[PDB]
Amino acid sequence: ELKQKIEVERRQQMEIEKHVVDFQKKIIEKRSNIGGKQIKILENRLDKAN
């Protein structure tokens, strides 16, 4: 009888879950991408010349 509602819900949620799986893939790729102090010592370099 009334099952097609829950079947289309399952299809929706499965597309959305695999879609956020794609999301996760994209974000791990960008993390791997981004995976790729001297000012004070330069002041020290200035001290000597002055």
């Binding site: 829950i6 399952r10 949620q13 879950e17 956020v20 999301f23 001297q38």
Partner: protein
């Protein structure tokens, strides 16, 4: 007669519901982890990361004091 056919149909409905719950909760938890990691990404990516070491004010100090010396 039809009452047992309805019984079997409702066993199918119970299985189907139970399933929908499993997958809905998987979806939630997956999304929560994904949002966690995405916010970690947006804060780890610095706003001065392109110039990994730039400090332009002190670069100006550098150049002007070099001219001075």
């Amino acid at each position: 007669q039809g009452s047992l056919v309805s019984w079997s149909g409702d066993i199918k409905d119970e299985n189907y519901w139970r399933r929908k719950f499993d997958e809905a909760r998987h979806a939630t938890k997956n999304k929560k982890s994904q949002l966690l990691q995405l916010q970690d990404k947006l804060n780890e990516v610095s706003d001065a990361k392109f110039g990994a070491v730039e400090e332009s004010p002190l670069m100006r100090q550098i150049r002007i004091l070099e001219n001075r010396l």
